[model samples]
Target: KKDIKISVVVPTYNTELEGLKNLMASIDKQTMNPDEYELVFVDDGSTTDTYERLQEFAETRPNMTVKQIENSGWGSRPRNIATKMAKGEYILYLDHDDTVFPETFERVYNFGKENNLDVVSGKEVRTNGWSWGWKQFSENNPHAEEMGIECLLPMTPHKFYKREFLLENDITFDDGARVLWEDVYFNSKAFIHGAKVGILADYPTYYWIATGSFGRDPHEKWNQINKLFNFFKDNIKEQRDLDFMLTHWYRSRVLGILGQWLLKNNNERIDIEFNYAKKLAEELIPAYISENLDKNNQVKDYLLRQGDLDSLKKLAQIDAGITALSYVEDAYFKEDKLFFKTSTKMTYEDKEDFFIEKTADRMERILPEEIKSKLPKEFFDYSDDLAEFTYEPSIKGRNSRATWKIDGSTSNVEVVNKKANLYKIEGEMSFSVQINDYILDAADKKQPWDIATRFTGLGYTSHRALTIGKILIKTALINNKTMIVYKNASGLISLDVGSSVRSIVEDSGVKREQILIDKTSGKVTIPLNEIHVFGESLIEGNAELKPVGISDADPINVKAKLIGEANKARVEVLLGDEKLSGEYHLVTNIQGKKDKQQIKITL
Candidate 1:
């Protein structure tokens, strides 16, 4: 490996050999020559498997090498040990279970040399789920160049550092515990020591396979994470490195740690772990760090620092769950537009009595009703109102419709008591707007707009699965590219363009038309046109089809057949559960065209 340009450093401990086979295959498939890059694997005492195939490959491949050592419980020691063994100009750190695309190394390696960077990073996507904070580093997002190293993703081994840079600064992992923040410690030091940092935004360099879980051991969690924060207290000897921690590194790093601590301490009897977590926050997190964090994280940090264990545990009990926001009634046409009246609510397990008993005496009266009048019904007074949400609802898509910045005027928040002291905070929002105001033409109808609200609050922002309800604006084609449109009460017509066929037309009570699914696009195109309704058959037959919108079930059914099918059919269907109590109507533009054709069914 005399002229090796890039050396990949990987550490394994009883890893899935299939994952290594995939990794090696991906490396072999790389656009960069295998000779130009090398693989250095340090097996930190794998008891399950020795990776004999890996060592044998290393024996034959001149550019690859494998090292075995006593198990260090984590990858930090092995990575730091392998850093000394890497001979390439730049060192790319990778986890043994993860993999890369063929173009990954070539793109990142060339990007580094073009800028002559000391450290180079690219985007990464996780196999299990989303990676936090660093998603903005993609090519679509160009803002990562200006942010500090702390703002970037810290837990991954997906970046490359110059070989000489580590040796010169004596940079290495803490090698203390099998805890977390090892990558953050390494990357922050490199960035602070004036490493010429470069980012390859478009090149997603790594496929991160999730390896660890948060529900493991609390003592182990406290042991590894606490020591890193403890190191921050007085570990650095140099002024610049210390200055780096004070200025750029400490805040986000501590916030990330707080997030992990909260996640691991979600269950009951968290006092032991909370004690250590509180101590770490009080001693290690500087004053300025807590002040500068997001209001939610800031509150958690404050609670930890003040040893507000009861409050933390109380809030932790209210883990993320289903929050529903939906229209209380059907949207109506008012003043030449659609008017939607909606309510948002969340239900939490009613454990308020426990905290209430601790804070209130048997006769020490408090105005429970008075507090209810001021705040919304869902706003419970934990942490003296631990959570507050500011929601701005907007429709997002190509040529999207109106946005409403709701305040106390258009929206009101109130708390209500359900059963067993379970409380619900119900927020109301109402708005009337013409889609024609923002939409250009019928083509805009084909563009689907998400009716999403940006939510802000403590523990409310991440991984919240809300089954909120809204009347979505969707489109569909009738008669195959013909501009079939629906006319509402406002004298406005929206052409059906992008609406999907949920179920095929069933004739004679048995499933008739065979539904065809496009394997590549997953698009379903049903064959049938122009349901013939002779003398109010829909009213006479009592058809249950509702208006066209995004529903879990298909609302309208036309006894149908695909194009060029030969089974004659007669009928229409709709969801049996839904009723068409609507201010909308579907009208065809052509005279006698509605009566020209009948829906046909085929076996």
Candidate 2:
């Protein structure tokens, strides 16, 4: 332990053992040597599974020192407690459930010594999913230099602060702001106090796990970006940490608290919280409007909930000139969906190509990000894919895409589609949007683009068991590989009208051959179930298959084969009720050329 040159200070609340296990495993894996660093865990107040593991690990690992503190709801109190007891010359503050990649400490130690610096700051992004703000960090290319005004938000994890540097200025996380902004004040104060600081460019030192700290849950939705209860001048004894709340840090806490408050209060028949959200927005926006306070637009508008369009309009009037530039579209609710009318009709050519990522049990459905953030995480989790976006059509061509395409595992859409065949009418409003369709056309298809199609049908599959309705589908997975299948049934059967295979293929890229269907004879050699293969292997001697361009939408007669093994590996006999309509059936075990497996795509 003494030979280890650095020590890590971990402060956590509601701690988990996974974080410690990952960290220890990482630290133990130093390519340089075993005795290079020590791990110190300061538990801020945990009522869970972390204690026994902490005891077990600490008893065994001499390099580790763990402490347990009483419960304190939130903030950097645990970190400050850990730092106060840190024994190393260089202190690294780590969160309980977060992790440090291997070599983090060693590389930082080498960098700090090279710069002869008092502190080192880099980046720490949230683990897994898409990152919110600070994503531009990688160790492959460390910054290796001093940062300017923009470096004010040094919220990176695993930062190394020299012990003496802390002692000299008396830097500690402010106890008053325990749950939030405490570290902001401490680190910002460190910078403002003129600590000799250096940074590693784009090096992500930690993986910060984000708890749904901000209450954006649908059950509690109004969000008002928050500001401190009192200014730093009036409250904190230290005047130097003013920059901490001046940027994104303060915005994060304020909005997060407001969001939680709205969730907890507004649902309690307390219109007061909704008003408070508006009031909070009014109070928060002006300060941010000034040149010094602006960070991101969401922070500015956090105060205005979707329910308060009237208030937003009024607020715009009060702000006057800033009002003209700030326009939040007005949304009219129609049943479960909200409809927003745009000022101009979108031209087909200028439409923005957009993708909405809706999480489904099967595939990812797509929706716009703005609407995605407004809706709570639970709604996303419990519900199917994002049915539609209240904002996309409203923003329309101004935002993204030529045609509006929403991917819903089972999503409902709200649009003024003149083309919609009225599906449902709830109250005075109508919900006639297109329901979920397996074939999702991602506009502007290019040649040799990756296309994934899924097929399912066992034994003698039911009616319209599984069908691929596109005229042409080329394999993006391999070159010179393509398959064009069409439904060849009458209107009474699946979604097929007589010669209805055309409905699935003729217009797409499915090429038809001169194979005749002998409806007049009883000896049908073709089994009820059959699958056709027409990629590289299937098209070899067959001259009927055609090569087409990306823009073409044509019709062709592409079938009539042997019951089980025609142009395809095997065919399936679908015999059940065709309620779902456009389904197909095929038992395909494509030998080895999986690269040429079936792709059920529709254009």
Candidate 3:
């Protein structure tokens, strides 16, 4: 194995010396070899006698270098001083209270060498400082900007950068940037200058303690963007970089920093249009190349005429997460494997009060502009006034999973009360169902799924597309695009998805046990196919509301007829409730209107 060269920089003020000592010990225990890196400690203004211990520690370790000077105030000065002294070709930045996993250095270093990446970034830790109330940021960036760290300000510990790129391009922390936005601005410039950025998925790298972290308290005034805008306008030398600052990254800061202020001030405000973000050629970075600096007609045509824009279009969607480039944090990657967490925020927090929903309009926005226009003008906007977080995972040209959810509205009691949790990793999926026995038992005892109720489907996020769906249940079902997979974790069988919650018992892969929750997991693989359960007995005089339909051969008109006889229309479907296999015919009437009619339902 080639020795991966790296230098870790720690810039601190008022840091607990004991915490630093513990941190040093962890760093010193390199799983590979310690000689591969040089640890540079830069003391920015600190209150404790941390200097004395560092001075003493340096004598024992040649690679461990320490700099003691009058406090330099912010984190940048020390980082700058240490960058000049760092001997490694690559750099890793760490915080005072943070620690790394067993193989952080080895895995990340190899990842950089393998991918030829200029920088590597991963997830950060935030403990209890999360909001203690109803509102909070789940470490998301709705409008993820494309420019730089300005998009994901502060929380700068999740990264490893190439020292050569920094020295060659003159990208340095404006520790004196007159702004807290230096990390973001400088980082983005490094990327725009064609620096390859690689993201780590598996192996949680950093543990950020919540003890001293900030919480979701709106009372504090933090105008971080003001400093950035001024700094970018005055210092940045390139026009392209400045333009990105004004648009991509700038827009994200406004949406996150100022938009938040507006959201707090106008808690009662409401809008039906795409409330969070929008994806079109004019404001995106997909595969299409545009000659005009603003945009090109070809790109616009592809957006409106083509069925779906490419993956790069995702980078441009209006996002609501914490960073400027609001790719959700739900996506986890380690090398070639990606883990997708199901929409579990509700069960974990909201209990079984609501089920996540995805509407047609919201579905349209998630897809590139081309594919959206072909489906149909939404008779109803699903994502309107809804809150959503989406994540997609990819390695090279392959996609691993996709999931989304809609917020607000609990119209359907049965569906709203049922919880669907999906966990994704590598190439398989696992599912868990929680049905509230207390309320479910009270429903019509004769019919299991007829426990009627409507639920407002909150919007959802799907970064990676599903490769295969395995389960086919007969209980409350979803009617749009969804895929279910059963995990056979170990080769003999086992699995862990979103929450890292594993299924050890096994997947039996037996249909007799389908929808049987009280039982334990059995070893098995549920392949993609329609699943059917015993049909529910209908109410004697119950009317048959013609269910909504989307068909290739039928006209847009939808009609219905009252049920003359109570013949069962048992629905057997894929795990995601993808419309059961059915047939519809296109028809034209004397009035010359085109329409579609359901012809057959083969059970």
Candidate 4:
């Protein structure tokens, strides 16, 4: 028998049949040979025909095992059981509803074998409109921690693991029913035990199908947090490693839970949760960890450290919301490259209360006079660390799920409107969508790339899709291909490279009034602002001028030339000796394609 290379372990619990079929079909389509890998599925007391269906799937398949166990409330028990049952050298944990790409198993397995990695994480994309926050996946990382805390993100079970590594380090799920962060605990153990982790970001591997949320009791969540804390402290020996894990835990768990409570205004549980958070904050997080947080989060950390639940609640109410808004003002092509200027800013509910007076120095948060009087002054002194805030533009492939950061510089903050406290920062960004450089998926050439600003500041860090402003549509020719930058149907700025003229004109939003015609001078002007044609110093062409009313009249030939103007281009037509009046068809060739447009001359 061939030695099994990898084992795909799936934990199922009443999974939807349609989604389950998707997962199975993706697995079946894997490029890796069936003989090289085994499928180990554990059904956690599924009520539906899920168990019988799994049995049916395994009946004819070789090296496949299916087992049914009593429900353990969460996926931890079944996951643990399936790991133990796996026989392959490597184990890949997959959810029942999620699916993998066709080359996922083959690519990830070979990458692991080549690198001799103990843990291999492939890039993942969510079906729901949410990011996995693994931006570090833009490039491969041999030592995953070199990319920082984001590398450990998502803590989901859709990663590859070496079976021996797990067994050697005695790394296993806690198996506690309804436990939160079980995956976190397992991965934490794997990292602390000196497991070599690798990341594969070149191609997307996992398709995280968004499903319904699972309800968990707050008390159970706190219990799991306590257990994870104790486990981390016991296993991690070095101060730096412990600090790293604690910082991640504090950000993901501590701030995450508290933020939810504040957003939901869970007044009843405020006292309970705040006290718990305060205790954890005092015990786990050091001063430097909190100092690294944004100005807004810094305030919360200070309140938590002081055990001031009342001030925390008040602060939450005052700083209730923040939104990152940005839009493109100018977009055009310069030497076969796309360039655009954008203005972005974070909007606050009570800007006056949360920020100090505008100054030439860095933007800093202002403590409410009430809170300021109580808290120490040195804690809010972020002058040295204020450089961390940034609003950078990035482009993400809609289909491929790949992201590339657009390089740019930002201008000083300026007030957008005097009536409101809307301060905005303007910046210029440019990038080229070369076929092989940024556009990798050849099969999906017409894929749209969405523009988003990754804003990090004001206690929030997220990628906000830029809104469409003044510049609605712009087209350019780059690398002998038509590149279209326009507002998509969703009103978000998007780029379509290697597009056709038909698609461009169809979506160009060009109307009849925009095309100009003069009867006496016989001059016809076609603005090339929205649609551009490249390659020639002057585009000279012949067009037919057919009178609208006289159907039998002979078509007159008109001379047309595309002239480059200041910051724009237009097509100028000279109808020699043809005194034009009323409506007529101006037929010509645009970008090697024949086109016709009706124009009225009022001579």
Candidate 5:
């Protein structure tokens, strides 16, 4: 019998049957051999038929076990219970509703074994509308600290862990009833214990299926928050590590929770949440930690720490209404890369000079008197930071988890109109997705990549997709691979690499015109417009010409080649010494696909 390399431990609580079936199907289709891993499902006293379904699933499968225990409001207890039952060298904690990719186990397991990793985190994408930055996962991070706070992120338990590492370190979930951030608590213990954590970013491994939300009582939320901070303070000894962990937690959890509360019009809940945040700011998060946050967050931190609820609420009103919009001005091709100029504007509830005002040397925030009176002067100066802000363009796979950032630079904010307080930040970006460089799998080469720009400044960051200013279609040959650049159906810029000419015409809206013929030279020309092919490109494979309306005549074999300069291409066919009259059928293979066109020859 093969040793169990890994065990998938899933905790289910009244899981939807459809999602459960989908999860099981994905597991059944794993690229890794079933014998190499085992499945352990622990149903947390589900009121539904989840436990019965698990038992049914386990009965017919080898290396599977099902266990049911008294209900635990959260996943912590069930996850801890399943961990003890796992017999494999590593344990992968999976949610009942979530699914894994076919290659998830194979890739992540091999990477862990090769690197001797204690914990391995594969890239994950969510099904819900929520989006998080995964640019850190563009490359594998051998060291956990290299990714810093991002490594600690997600706080989701969908990660691979060595069973020995967990046992030795006594790393387990808090298991408190309805506990929040139990995964964070578990991961924190692992990180603090000197575990060798690695990130597998090349492939999208886990799919977090969205479920219904649960409401937490205001006081209970604060209790859990306090418990988590206490754990960090007591366990993490190193000042640097403590600060690192606290800063990330404060930014992601503290500010996020407070922001949500402020968005609600409920004054009672807002006051309660504000007090909780203020207490955390004063007790848990140190003053120096605020320096690590963005300017806007820094202001909030100051307001919270100062215990100025009124001012905090006022600032929230302004920040909540902030919106930013980006648009493309022009797009063209330079060599084999796509280049575009775009501009973005930030507005706040139609309030003039709410965030910033242009100066001779800088654009500084028009801070509210209440905020400015209490905060330091430096917080209002966004000049140097705004000047340094670079608008990065990136393409995300519409159907996959792949993302690639386009290389570019941005111009300083310029005043569009002083009276209207309209300011614009312009950027120029040029990039080409090299098939050989980023895309390793051939199947993904055909996936449509959506173009968007990431603008980070003025205490806010936004990733806005560029809207089509004009419809333009262009093609480029990069690394001996054909690429099509065009606007997708949503009128957004998109790219498709290694595409066929037929796809270019049908999908990219490129028109197919009548074929050109020259009687004197005895050459037939097929025009390929907007396709940038430099110099002569020899066309190989089958080409035949048959006389039109004359089925008796034998098809004549012909030689064809493409010659072009700039964004124009023409296929020239040598008709040989055979004198042709009237029309002829020209059938040939272009870009690995058969194409037929009619040409009339008059002599």
Candidate 6:
């Protein structure tokens, strides 16, 4: 035990046997040698079956030990006790339900050793079911950034801590009975007394299991949060630390996690808890912190500050509750400006009815509250003619979560009601609009290359990804000839591809025989296998016709740009003058990936 490199301390109570087995399996299968680490299982007075299971497992395993204690009713006590008992150079705290990656400890240990890090934090994936976690902090960035008491870190204790550091600073969990947010209180001190911190975001290490068994109540968590805030307020010494704790730490709770809870649950208990949160926030949260919150989240935060339960109801009506559909009639670029005549239809609660169909569980009669009366009413206002907000378009890398920030504009846009709340907002804008493509990873490569627009202002920010099309493109060059490869898994192309062409060529005119079309299992491989051409070719498609479900022939127009970096740029995709439908990928290689570059079009 004294020779152990790392000590894994897990506190368990009434946990499933399967979960325990899985946890053990994950640890046992770790890349770190078994002798290098020790597993400290602190059973917080679980049932006899669980205790026996733990005891048997500990007896069978090497360097694994179990300690039985009376039910502490809180996880913090057992964890704190285990922290004291830890004999390894580094200590790792884990919940019974959670599982770590096999290489989690090994990688973390190496990082902690190499960097002489006091704390090694890695990214986590909160298992599906709507638990919010921060991406800015959690993503894989191994290089330790500045250790001010400002930046918010992951609150969960699924991190490696040098035992010496923990002991020297007297950092320990608040083991009060029925206490909530023990991890936050403990981690607050860790961050507060940080010497060296290493962030590991190369890959996710912890799998936060979403067992639908516990933590269903909003008030319990909120009450605990209130307590945690009070503890933090009192414990932190410096004004900067206090300010940072309130604004970045607690504000993150309000916006990232607790806000989601308030959005979903509309109860008297939560109302009271929120009042507690609001008063604390009003006293603590600095103006700058409030301003730093994302637009939509800021609106929610402002609503809480006002203690405007009525407006919160209205805001909740649209928080993850409204969907907007945008239709572009036409788009044209004038130099750096993007001018488009588009229409938008906003649907609340999966329907066009904005107010009436707000929430199904709403018991009280919602009195008519003026849309402009609410705090930050710009984004939340329903009955408004002109709404002003800034929109930032981002193309998120499909594989790596790398982001490419692109064109954006602040539009005091117009809204015209089409039917019910299904309104339309259309306008023309002048900005230095730039259009570029991203190297999509597997998940995004097969998906519609969408540009997600983040609309911000009036203390509200909402994201809407404008899906270009569902079509996908692949490329193959054989013997210095280009092949336009595409996938029609969704039957995006149901028209003819033959000699009777409708597209006008930009480069070398191709013979009908030169275009080779092969179809199998919803895959189309069109070879622009032309021998002699130059630069690039534009095979613009002008197909007239019947789409999958439409009776009217909406003219299907496409601009297919082809590139041949090695050989001649050939114009050769025969859109054989036949009526077509649905969606399509037009191969346009302006960024030098040959025929792999695709422009998505949906009719």
lDDT of each: 0.51, 0.39, 0.40, 0.68, 0.70, 0.54
Clashing pairs in 6: 140-201, 295-459, 295-460, 295-461, 296-460, 296-461
lDDT of 3 by residue, 196-297 (tens): 765554434455554532212321113453445555566656666566555554334332332223333333321211222122223432332322212212
Return the TM-score for each candidate structure. 0.55, 0.45, 0.44, 0.76, 0.77, 0.57
Candidate 6 minimal-lDDT segment of 10 residues: 493-502
Decreasing TM-score order of the candidates: 5, 4, 6, 1, 2, 3
TM-score of 1: 0.55
Q: What is the Cα-based TM-score of model 3?
A: 0.44
TM-score for candidate 2: 0.45
Error of 2 at 601 (Å): 30
Q: Which stretches of candidate 1 lie over 4 Å from their true place?
A: 59-62, 70-74, 134-146, 176-179, 211-220, 235-269, 294-308, 315-454, 457-459, 463-603
Candidate 4 minimal-lDDT segment of 10 residues: 350-359
Candidate 2 residues lying further than 4 Å off, grouped into runs, are: 1-3, 12-14, 44-49, 70-77, 132-149, 154-158, 211-309, 313-603
Better model by TM-score, 3 or 4? 4
lDDT, candidate 6, 1-603, per-residue tens: 348888999998899878888888878878888989999988777764787888888888889889987764677778878888888999988889888776787888887788888877776656432122344443444455464543336567787889999999999887546566566777778777765777776545677676761344666766666676777777777766776677665556665534446565548766666776777677756666765554555666776777776666665554545554333334433322333333333445325532321223321122345744454543343332135545444433322233444444433444444554344433322222232233322222322222344443333344554432335232322222222222234322111111111121211233434443333222222334333332343433322222434455455443333444444444433344434445554442222322332333343
lDDT of 2 by residue, 1-603 (tens): 355456788765566566667667656755446566677777755777676668788898777788887765555666677777666767877666666655567667787777776777755545332222221232222332244323534454357888778878888776653234455556556665666766654334555665544444432333322434343434333322444344343454434343323334434443544565556545544453323432223423543545543333333332221100111122222222222221211111213311223233422213246544654343323123223222111000101111122222221233232322211101111111111121122211211111111111110001111122323221111112222222223111011111112211222222113222233341112122122233222211100111233244232212222121223332221222212213222112221111122223111
lDDT of 3: 0.40
| Residues forming the 10-long window of minimal summed lDDT in candidate 2 | 455-464
Candidate maximizing lDDT: 5
Better of 3 and 6 by lDDT: 6
Off by over 4 Å in 6: 129-134, 137-147, 150-152, 213-222, 248-267, 281-308, 315-603
Residues 267-308 of candidate 4 have per-residue lDDT tens digits of 766666677788877776678987566555766787778777
Model 2 has an lDDT value of 0.39
